[PDB]
Design a protein around this ligand. Sequence first.
Ligand code: HEM
Ligand SMILES: [Ca+2]
Ligand SMILES: [Ca+2]
Length: 306
Amino acid sequence: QLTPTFYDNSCPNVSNIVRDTIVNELRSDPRIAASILRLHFHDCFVNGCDASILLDNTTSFRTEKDAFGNANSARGFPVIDRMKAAVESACPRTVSCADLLTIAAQQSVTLAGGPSWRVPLGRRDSLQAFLDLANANLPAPFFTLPQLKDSFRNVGLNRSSDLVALSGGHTFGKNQCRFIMDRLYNFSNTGLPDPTLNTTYLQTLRGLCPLNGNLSALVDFDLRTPTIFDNKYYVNLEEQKGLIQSDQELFSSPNATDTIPLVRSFANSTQTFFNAFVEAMDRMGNITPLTGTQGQIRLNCRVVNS
Ligand code: HEM
Ligand SMILES: [Ca+2]
Ligand SMILES: [Ca+2]
């Protein structure tokens, strides 16, 4: 069983070391908090939160970094190496990369203005990476609501609250133009924009992402508070201003009978959202972890110990 007090004796200052690292990085890169939270999400959705995503290529297995959901998208790996080194110095061979990334995700949310809580700990590190599983398990922005629900259920999160609350991670961070081009100019081969996208916002997004333009150009997920972790993400959905298809479907999909009330509830109360986010985050952080003597305490998050 994972427990929040796992390192209270072996490495009491682990959380503080992680926090300090993120604080320093944020000065030069205000996007790092969002990036780190996303890394934890992509870790947990593939064989569980086992730091499998942090592993680099080997001649026996490919890195998840080349998955369709990670390539030229996932970022912040050097920052993780930095805090890991700092933690190894303070507490040699004690904190697993999987736990480190979980704490980093929680601290990132808090630093961005979100809720503060102690995450369950005790996870251990994987002995391999899973590229095929990542391509199969990571959801895509073009998924319909039923597909989004299927993706979450596939990894163990059955609750619509899990999906709606965790999608709140899009209250900050960046998104490439490439992922919304269809919504802007030709959605579902209709030759028309996605009707669920607010027409005023459509104009703005088209100006940021012109047809035949730079597909790698970045746009803010939350037009209200781009770098602050708050419930504004849901207020946007209510006004048809969710950035990607998967965002707006939580409120506009024909299958959203169960998610609409959750979206409204989170838009109406920050407390309601924050409570749900912590609950969902801990549930996601509890997906098939390696514990006890299973796996290892990786010294270099990029490679399995030898
Ligand atoms: C429900 C399905 C989800 C889909 C389809 C999805 C899709 C995406 C896409 C397309 C991007 C843009 C990547 C890029 O342009 O490079 C992204 C970014 C991001 N996502 Fe999600 N996401 C989902 C769920 C989540 C969850 C559960 C979290 C965390 C709790 C999360 C946190 C983030 C963050 C913070 C970013 C910004 C990262 C950065 O700026 O570096 N996402 N997501
Ligand atoms: Ca993983
Ligand atoms: Ca925000």
